[PDB]
């Protein structure tokens, strides 16, 4: 951290303070004018309303912009300066020279679209990270060949400073600028910087299509909100109120699952092959009784039998509507048969086939009675009940007889039926479409609306009529312009929740764009759910297949996407490894060959010479080894991490460090990491590939065959 960096940061902080002072002055002026206009306008009502609303809009815009006023700065090749922020601030005393540019302004376009391969007449792009009225720090990126003296938290300038670099720039530009407006799959090996390219790509896409997606909203899915962090730090108008974040266990609104299922039940539950099971499950609830159920009617001893129940459920199946929707057909057919039989029984001697107005009249009486008969309703609840996804899944998992009948494997039985894992979430959501809504009637709300409309109509009737007007001349009356319904609606609460709240609470919301980080981990059912939630098929899919740890995760992008966008999805792969030292990739390739004889290791520039080191730990010194590792890396710059099984207190589990990078990385006892589940080797690979400066390993007895190199 250079001292000159601190001086530059202080200068930028002072500039932002001046901008905020001008903002405060403008807000004070606006408040004063707004109060004066509200109090003593002295003009016409329409003009008063116009000025008041304009001033209120200005005040609200300033209040919104108060948080994180300035996004960053642009250095033009002419050595000029352009500040990008949430508001346009101009020097009225200097020909309105821009002191701050609104991010939507045309000259602020480069800040989002410029790249090192196609610099839009800019040499440096500077981002400010702000927690309020204060700039915490700034990070710069050179739009060209770097030199290493620049300070950026991502270290991209230093890593690229350590032509192949030209090809890296060209590839990153090709990914970023792609005008596909479709499903884009970005893949890259570790140390290539797929995260940075994905962030720039999503920023470009959101900026260029902001008008088309300002109302639909953007959904973000991944193990961490980092992508939403970047979106908020570059597009607050969209990140704060329009963006939405969800983990695969949080797709269902309200529910929030974190437990994960076993690596075999998850696989079956994560594949469309289980869809046929779900249908069967809801078909398994089309029960018919093993013994006749007495109706226990008041006068007649009617009863229902497996014969008529079979016929009724057969007809309801033939209708093809969802469960709670075909309930109507089932109940109607059952009622038809039971009423025919009951009327025949009551119609003895005096009535045989008097179809017109006598037989039919008794049918009417019998149906009118039966529809309110408690025992009949209880029977129709026992047969073909109304179901929710939980009612289906819990019973299906617990019974162990329903699983056998439905063809579901016994790999997924559990007594705690209502204990949900992340794998059950997509099934629970799909059961929403399979079961359907009961299509109930909202009588109470309708009555409330009717009463409000009646009161509004009474209010209108309370006004003077045209015939009785005493004014000098005829004029428009309120009754000529507004009706009772409009007036009644005018005074309702009309909730106006934000999109970030409105969409997240709606299971059926269709988003304008979907971003998926670490997308290889999603199961096929998760892809089905997301595609159901994004009919536009506008996706930014980021991940790496070789780093998968879930069993249901993707093994080939084609197998996941061809079902929805055959051939239309565009694949971009990044080739060059530069962020990690080549020595790290030396062992990463060895660990990676276990899954493919050749695989596709990226070629590695920037060899550092500081070789990774491996240490034997014996006689209760592993805990020490990590203790001195952390004590040493505390004073050696940057950030450092230790990765190992949770059985060691001082290590983060390998799954958590999926998308992060660090200067010093220690991995403890890889022999246990290898044995962790079906993907232990992959975990090791991930854990190894997080190091940018220094890599250490602790092993107990001997290095595993792959790790014998270091």
């Amino acid at each position: 951290s250079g001292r000159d960096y601190e001086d530059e940061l202080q200068s930028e902080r002072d500039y932002v303070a001046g901008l905020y002072a001008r903002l405060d002055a403008e807000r004070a002026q606006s408040q004063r004018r707004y109060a004066a206009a509200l109090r003593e306008h002295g003009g016409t009502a329409v003009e008063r309303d116009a000025e008041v609303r304009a001033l209120a809009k200005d005040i609200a815009r300033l209040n919104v912009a108060d948080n994180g006023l300035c996004f960053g700065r642009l250095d033009t090749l002419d050595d000029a300066r352009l500040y990008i922020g949430r508001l346009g601030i101009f020097d009225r005393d200097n020909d309105f020279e821009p002191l701050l540019l609104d991010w939507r302004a045309p000259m602020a376009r480069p800040f989002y679209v410029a790249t090192a391969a196609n610099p839009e007449n800019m040499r440096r792009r500077r981002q400010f990270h702000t927690l309020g009225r204060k700039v915490v720090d700034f990070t710069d990126e050179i739009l060209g060949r770097p030199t290493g003296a620049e300070h950026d938290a991502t270290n991209d300038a230093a890593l690229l400073a350590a032509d192949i670099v030209a090809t890296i720039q060209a590839e990153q530009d090709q990914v970023i600028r792609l005008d596909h407006t479709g499903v884009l799959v970005i893949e890259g090996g570790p140390g290539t910087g797929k995260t940075v390219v994905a962030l720039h790509r999503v920023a470009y896409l959101l900026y260029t299509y902001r008008k088309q997606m300002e109302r639909h909203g953007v959904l973000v899915v991944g193990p961490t909100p980092a992508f939403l962090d970047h979106i908020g730090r570059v597009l607050p108008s969209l990140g704060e109120s329009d963006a939405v974040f969800m983990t695969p266990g949080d797709f269902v609104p309200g529910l929030h699952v974190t437990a994960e299922d076993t690596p075999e039940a998850a696989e079956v539950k994560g594949s469309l092959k289980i869809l046929d099971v779900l249908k069967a499950a809801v078909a398994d609830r089309q029960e018919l009784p093993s013994e006749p159920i007495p109706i226990d009617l008041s006068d007649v001893t009617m009863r229902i039998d497996a014969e008529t129940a079979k016929w009724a459920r057969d007809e309801a199946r033939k209708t093809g509507l969802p469960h709670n929707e075909a309930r109507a057909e089932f109940v109607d057919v059952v009622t038809y048969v039971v009423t025919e039989r009951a009327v025949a029984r009551i119609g003895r001697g005096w009535l045989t086939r008097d179809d017109k107005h006598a037989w039919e009249k008794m049918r009417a009486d019998v149906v009118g009675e039966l529809e309110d008969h408690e025992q009949f309703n209880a029977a129709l609840d026992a047969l073909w009940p109304i179901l929710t996804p939980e009612d289906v899944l819990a019973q299906l998992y617990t019974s162990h007889e329903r699983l056998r009948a439905a063809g579901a494997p016994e790999c997924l039985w559990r007594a705690d039926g209502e204990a949900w894992t992340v794998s059950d979430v997509p099934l629970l959501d799909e059961l929403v479409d399979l079961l359907g809504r009961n299509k109930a009637a909202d009588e109470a709300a309708e009555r409330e609306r009717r009463e409000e409309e009646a009161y509004a109509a009474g209010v209108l009737d309370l006004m003077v009529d045209r015939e009785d007007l005493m004014d000098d001349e005829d004029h428009l009356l309120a009754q000529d312009l507004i009706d009772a319904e409009e007036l009644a609606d005018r005074f309702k609460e009309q909730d106006n929740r934000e999109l970030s709240e409105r969409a997240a609470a709606d299971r059926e919301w269709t988003y304008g764009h979907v971003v998926v980080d670490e997308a290889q981990e999603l199961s096929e059912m998760d892809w089905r759910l997301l595609m159901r939630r994004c009919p536009r098929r506008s996706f930014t899919i980021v991940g790496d297949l070789a780093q998968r740890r879930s069993p249901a995760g993707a093994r080939s992008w084609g197998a996941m996407l061809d079902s929805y966008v055959p051939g239309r999805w565009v694949y971009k792969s990044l080739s060059v490894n530069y962020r990690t030292p080549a020595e790290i990739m030396a062992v990463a390739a060895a660990v990676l060959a276990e899954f493919a004889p050749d695989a596709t290791p990226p070629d590695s520039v920037r060899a550092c010479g500081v070789a990774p080191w491996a240490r034997q730990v014996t006689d209760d010194d592993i805990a020490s080894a990590i203790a001195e590792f952390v004590s040493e890396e505390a004073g050696r710059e940057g950030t450092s991490v230790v990765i190992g099984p949770p059985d060691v207190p001082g290590t983060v589990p390998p799954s958590e460090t999926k998308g992060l990078e660090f200067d010093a990385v220690l991995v403890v006892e890889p022999e246990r990491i290898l044995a962790d589940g079906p993907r232990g080797a992959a975990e090791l690979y991930v854990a190894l590939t997080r190091a940018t400066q220094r890599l250490g390993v602790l092993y107990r007895d001997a290095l595993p065959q792959a790790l014998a190199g270091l």
Binding site: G43, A50, A456, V459, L460, L476, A478
Partner: protein, 97 residues
């Protein structure tokens, strides 16, 4: 605002037009400015301000386009005044009840 201040400064204290306003009898300095100063800004049919002001005054006489754009809010007010009474009566009836 500057034109209104200049108009207020220029007028003699005993001028009948300003005498009526300053005595609390009728009108405002806004109406006096619109008459002998400048009409100012006018609103679109959708309520937004038109950035081009009516630099002319009714003393000088408005041009054709200035008059046409001025007619918008003039007609809008006719319906606005009628509509406001509905809400006023709604609240009044609730309070009376």
């Amino acid at each position: 605002e500057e034109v209104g201040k200049a108009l207020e400064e220029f007028y003699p204290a005993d001028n009948p037009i300003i005498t009526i306003v300053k005595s609390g009898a009728t009108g405002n300095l806004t109406q006096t400015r619109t008459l002998a100063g400048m009409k100012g800004l006018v609103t679109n049919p959708k309520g937004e301000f038109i950035p081009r002001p009516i630099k002319s005054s009714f003393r000088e006489g408005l041009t054709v386009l200035e008059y046409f754009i001025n007619t918008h809010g003039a007609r809008k007010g006719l319906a606005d005044t009628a509509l406001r009474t509905a809400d006023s009566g709604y609240l009044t009836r609730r309070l009376v009840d």
